[PDB]
C-alpha cells in the first residue's frame, strides 16, 4: 500500500508526506533537461540507467513525468508541478522537490540546488517506489566538507575520486587538497607538479565539478618562504605560478596554510595573503574567497586570559576581511566547540569563522579507528561559523562513517542528533552488515592519546554503565546473576559480530579495520574470562578462578602489545578492573 520515506542524508529541512507514494514506471517523461543544470541531469541520467528506467523519446501520458530546472529557467510546466511550492525564496544551494500524482518536480534555487534535488530524489527511490512528499530544503552552513590535511600516507587517486562521488551524494561541497606529506604541497612547495601528477589533478578537478564540489588547492609555504626584497618577490611569484597552473586546469578555490611552522611573522603571513587576494583572487574575478589557517589556530594557542596572543592580534588586525580563516576549536583535537569559543574567536577576527575539525583524523594515534559521529559541536555554531570541514583518516573508506554525519550536521545543524546520525550513517553505508558494523564501530568512537588529543563520543557508553553497575552490585553484595547473564550475551555478541564482519566485509572496508576486528574479538574473549573469574570467586572455586585468570591475562597481554587499539576504557579496561 503506502511507501515510507527511507533514510535520507542530510536531513531535509522541510518534508511532508502528501500521499501514499507511487511506483515509477519502466520509462518516464523527462522535461526541462535542455535548460536544467548539466551536472544534475547527468547525475539523474546515471541513476535512471542504473535502475533500468528508460527516458521516452516522445511524451507518453501514461508514464511518470519528471520535471527539472532552476528558478532562473523559464519553464512554466515545472511551476505547475510544484503546486505553489517554490525554490525562489530559498538561500543558494536550496531546492524544492514534489512528488504527487505521478509527477516528480525538482526546482533548484540555482544549479548546485538542482543537483542536490537530484541527490534527494536518488535517496527517496527504492525498487521504483517513491513516496509522495513536498520538500523545500537548504544548508545551514554554506561551505561543508573535507580538508585532506593529515600527516601520513596521502589518499590515492582512486580514493579521492570515490570520495568526491561520496561528497556529491551527501551534499558536501568543499574538498581541500592539502596533504602534509605531499612534497609539492609543503616540503617542496616551489616545485611544479610533473606532467603525470598534473593529469591526475585534471581528473580530480573534473570530477569535483561533476559533483558540485569546490576543489580547493592548498599550499603550505611557511617552512622556508622569504618575505623581504627580491627573495620575497621571487617566492611570492612561486605561489602565483603554482596557483596559476591549477587555475589553468579549472581550479577556482585556493588556500594558503601557515600551521605547524617555526616562523611566527604574523604581519608577513597576512601580507602574503592580502597580496595574493588582490593580485590573484580578485583579479581573476571568478575565484572564491581565499582560505587560510594561522600559525596559532586553536583557542589555547590563540588566546591568553580572554585576550589574543601577539601573533593572533597582529594576524587578525592585518588579514583582509574577505579571507576565510580556519581554527580547530578550543584545542587542536578537543571534546567540544562550545558556542562561546566560536563567539570569542569570531570576535577577535571580526568575521564568521571556518572550522578545521580534527576528527576523524588519527595521525597522532594510528592504532585506533575514529568511527563515531560529529560530537561536541554546538548546534548554534552557524551563528559564528559559515565554513565547516573535517580532517579525515588516512583510511578513506572508514572515514565515510564520520563524514556522513558531518554532512548531516552542517546541512541541517539544529535538527542534528549525533546518535541518530551515527546509526543512519552505518545503516546507509553497510546495508546487510549494518547491525554488526554498529556493534564493532560502537567500541571505536573515542580518541584519546592521554595528553593533548581528546575527541569523540565515548566508547560503548551503555556497556560501561552495565560494567560499572556490576562492580557496584558486587561490592555491596547484591544478586548480580541477571547482570552477569546479560553481560555474557554482550561479549558473545561482540565476538559474533566481529567474526561476521571479518567474513563478509568487502575488501575496501576490511583492509582498513581487520587488525581492530581481531583486537575486539580478543578483548571480548578476555571480558568473558573476566566474568568467569567473577563467578568463580562468587562460587569459591579456586581451580576455575586461576584458570579464567590466566585466560583473561593472556587476552589482555595480546591486546596491550597489539598495534591495533580499540575500546580502551570499556572492553580493555574491564579486563584490567577484574584482574
Amino acid at each position: 500500500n503506502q511507501v515510507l520515506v527511507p533514510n535520507l542524508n542530510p536531513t531535509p529541512e522541510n518534508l511532508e508526506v502528501v500521499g501514499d507514494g507511487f511506483k515509477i514506471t519502466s520509462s518516464i517523461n523527462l522535461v526541462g533537461e535542455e535548460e536544467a543544470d548539466e551536472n544534475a541531469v547527468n547525475a539523474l541520467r546515471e541513476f535512471l540507467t542504473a535502475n533500468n528506467i528508460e527516458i521516452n523519446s516522445e511524451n507518453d501520458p501514461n508514464s511518470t513525468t519528471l520535471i527539472i530546472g532552476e528558478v532562473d529557467d523559464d519553464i512554466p510546466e515545472l511551476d505547475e508541478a510544484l503546486n505553489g511550492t517554490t525554490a525562489e525564496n530559498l538561500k543558494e544551494e536550496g531546492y524544492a522537490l514534489v512528488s504527487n500524482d505521478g509527477k516528480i518536480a525538482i526546482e533548484g534555487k540555482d544549479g548546485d540546488g538542482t543537483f542536490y534535488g537530484v541527490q534527494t530524489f536518488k535517496q527517496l527511490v527504492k525498487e521504483s517506489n517513491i513516496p509522495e512528499v513536498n520538500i523545500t530544503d537548504y544548508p545551514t552552513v554554506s561551505a561543508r566538507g573535507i580538508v585532506e590535511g593529515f600527516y601520513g600516507t596521502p589518499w590515492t587517486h582512486q580514493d579521492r575520486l570515490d570520495q568526491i562521488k561520496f561528497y556529491g551524494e551527501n551534499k558536501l561541497n568543499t574538498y581541500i587538497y592539502a596533504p602534509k606529506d605531499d612534497p609539492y604541497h609543503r616540503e617542496k612547495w616551489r616545485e611544479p607538479y610533473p606532467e603525470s601528477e598534473m593529469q591526475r589533478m585534471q581528473e580530480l578537478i573534473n570530477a569535483s565539478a561533476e559533483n558540485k564540489v569546490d576543489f580547493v588547492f592548498g599550499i603550505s609555504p611557511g617552512i622556508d618562504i622569504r618575505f623581504d626584497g627580491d627573495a620575497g618577490e621571487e617566492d611570492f611569484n612561486h605561489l602565483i605560478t603554482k596557483a596559476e597552473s591549477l587555475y589553468d586546469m579549472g581550479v577556482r578555490s585556493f588556500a594558503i596554510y601557515w600551521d605547524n611552522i617555526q616562523d611566527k611573522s604574523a604581519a608577513k603571513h597576512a601580507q602574503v595573503l592580502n597580496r595574493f587576494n588582490e593580485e590573484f583572487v580578485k583579479a581573476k574575478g571568478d575565484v572564491k574567497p581565499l582560505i587560510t589557517v594561522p600559525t596559532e589556530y586553536d583557542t589555547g594557542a590563540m588566546v591568553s586570559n580572554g585576550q589574543p596572543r601577539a601573533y593572533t592580534r597582529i594576524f587578525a588586525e592585518t588579514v583582509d576581511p574577505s579571507i576565510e580563516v580556519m581554527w580547530t576549536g578550543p584545542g587542536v583535537v578537543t571534546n567540544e566547540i562550545p558556542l562561546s569559543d566560536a563567539q570569542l574567536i569570531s570576535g577577535i577576527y571580526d568575521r564568521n569563522m571556518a572550522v578545521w575539525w580534527n576528527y576523524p583524523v588519527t595521525d597522532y594515534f594510528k592504532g585506533k579507528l575514529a568511527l563515531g559521529p560529529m560530537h561536541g559541536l554546538d548546534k548554534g555554531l552557524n551563528q559564528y561559523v559559515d565554513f565547516f570541514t573535517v580532517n579525515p583518516m588516512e583510511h578513506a573508506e572508514l572515514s565515510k562513517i564520520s563524514i556522513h554525519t558531518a554532512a548531516d550536521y552542517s546541512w541541517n545543524m539544529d535538527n542534528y542528533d549525533y546518535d541518530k546520525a551515527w546509526n543512519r550513517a552505518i545503516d546507509m553505508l553497510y546495508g546487510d552488515l549494518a547491525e554488526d558494523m554498529k556493534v564493532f564501530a560502537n567500541h571505536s568512537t573515542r580518541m584519546d592519546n592521554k595528553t593533548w588529543a581528546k575527541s569523540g563520543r565515548e566508547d560503548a557508553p551503555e556497556l560501561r554503565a552495565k560494567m560499572d553497575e556490576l562492580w557496584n552490585k558486587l561490592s555491596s553484595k547484591e544478586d548480580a546473576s541477571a547482570l552477569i547473564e546479560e553481560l555474557y550475551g554482550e561479549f558473545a555478541r561482540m565476538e559474533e559480530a566481529c567474526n561476521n564482519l571479518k567474513a563478509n566485509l568487502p575488501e575496501v572496508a576490511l583492509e582498513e579495520c581487520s587488525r581492530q576486528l581481531d583486537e575486539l574479538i580478543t578483548l571480548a574473549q578476555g571480558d568473558k574470562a573476566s566474568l568467569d573469574m567473577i563467578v568463580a570467586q562468587l562460587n569459591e572455586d579456586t581451580e576455575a578462578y586461576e584458570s579464567a585468570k590466566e585466560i583473561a591475562q593472556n587476552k589482555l597481554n595480546t591486546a596491550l602489545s597489539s598495534f591495533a587499539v580499540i575500546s580502551e576504557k570499556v572492553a580493555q579496561s574491564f579486563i584490567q578492573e577484574a584482574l
Binding site: 600527516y151 606529506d181 605547524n260 595521525d363 597522532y364 595528553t451
Partner: peptide, 5 residues
C-alpha cells in the same frame, strides 16, 4: 613530528 604537537 608527524602530528600537531
Amino acid at each position: 613530528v608527524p602530528y600537531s604537537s
